[PDB]
């Protein structure tokens with residue numbers, strides 16, 4: 008049996024990240040999870056191949072969607088694992104040094120808090136399981152509110168931050184990762200003072216976080232664990248199906264599953280850089296018909312026939328400059344950067360703007376602008392001005408990193424942003440409007456859960 012020594016507990020901990028890596032069943036950072044995360048904003052249109060993603064993209068999904076179901080249950084698999092470790096550690100604490108106990112608890116609570124965050128971010132109100140039975144329990148359990156789930160997540164992440172080291176092996180959390188995750192929960196709750204409290208210190212000694220000079224190093228193989236990295240996942244490192252082939256054009260052997268919308272391209276192109284060129288972030292994120300655009304190591308206009316010169320293609324997290332194709336199986340893996348320092352800077356910008364330190368906020372925005380070789384912020388020194396560029400910089404900075412939908416949602420900008428993006432998607436989205444909510448703002452509790460758990464009420468609007 009297991010649980011015998013420090014090595015066994017360390018192996019258990021590593022296994023708690025596996026549900027984030029799951030490819031086909033809704034693991035959060037696996038290919039299908041990524042699709043669900045990017046599908047609902049104005050970033051991309053999906054083709055109608057992977058039906059459960061297409062319905063999500065189009066706002067026609069139901070509470071039987073197998074992929075959103077899978078996402079739900081992956082979260083609970085991970086919770087079961089983290090709860091089990093906590094229980095086993097308590098049971099066996101007498102054989103472990105207090106230092107080892109602290110290391111395990113710190114990591115385990117980081118992991119539990121991160122998953123709890125995502126659970127209530129995606130499903131709003133949901134059953135809150137903080138104990139693990141011998142088997143994952145199918146006993147009935149009424150939902151907890153988003154606030155209560157996030158309360159647990161904050162408690163976990165506070166304790167984690169206090170116990171974790173300033174540096175760690177790649178894929179293992181640091182105190183900075185715990186603080187940054189905690190800060191994000193404060194941002195989502197509009198607790199601006201506490202966001203500032205936990206995030207501002209991350210910009211100072213003894214931390215070493217910095218924006219990398221080359222934005223693209225955040226999304227490559229060779230600069231994994233770079234100086235901007237806060238927490239990264241090694242997806243291939245796991246009680247074949249990877250991201251880049253999905254988004255590459257048929258012309259280079261891919262499955263062309265999604266393309267950037269006109270609206271998102273308009274956002275990328277709006278403001279040119281100090282030298283008059285397109286924002287380097289846009290040039291790292293999408294391929295389109297501009298002079299010198301390359302795609303899989305050929306000129307754009309040579310890869311694509313003339314009738315396709317007006318199309319748009321995703322580059323972020325693709326092998327678009329290291330390779331000429333996307334073979335299957337993949338030759339290498341590009342870690343998912345779950346948290347990076349740009350996130351801390353833009354979260355501070357947002358917190359300071361909302362609290363009323365506009366100059367401070369602008370300073371943080373300008374760090375982001377300067378890395379991208381843009382002029383500094385030139386909008387009015389007002390909350391509304393600074394908010395307009397916050398939104399704009401986040402859209403460009405975190406394209407297809409799974410932020411845009413949740414951002415638009417929490418800001419109350421989603422409805423108007425979909426309105427300008429596509430008439431039919433907007434029409435479908437508006438069918439979800441009832442009372443003062445929209446049912447499409449969160450994935451519904453799956454039909455399977457409502458059937459198996461009679462104390463669970465359906466999601467509002469569903």
Ligand SMILES: [Ca+2]
Pocket residue numbers: 071072073
């Ligand atoms: Ca199905």
Ligand SMILES: [Ca+2]
Pocket residue numbers: 168169170171172173182
């Ligand atoms: Ca520490």
Ligand SMILES: [Ca+2]
Pocket residue numbers: 228231339340341342
């Ligand atoms: Ca790698």
Ligand SMILES: [Ca+2]
Pocket residue numbers: 270427428429
């Ligand atoms: Ca439009």
Ligand SMILES: [Cl-]
Pocket residue numbers: 065067431435
């Ligand atoms: Cl449709």
Ligand SMILES: [Cl-]
Pocket residue numbers: 059062067068069070071072073
């Ligand atoms: Cl569906």
Ligand SMILES: [Cl-]
Pocket residue numbers: 175176177232
């Ligand atoms: Cl390492």
Ligand SMILES: [Cl-]
Pocket residue numbers: 177231232
């Ligand atoms: Cl490393």
Ligand SMILES: [Cl-]
Pocket residue numbers: 197198199200201
């Ligand atoms: Cl506040």
Ligand SMILES: [Cl-]
Pocket residue numbers: 266267317318319320
């Ligand atoms: Cl296109």
Ligand SMILES: [Cl-]
Pocket residue numbers: 415416418419420421422423
């Ligand atoms: Cl909205």
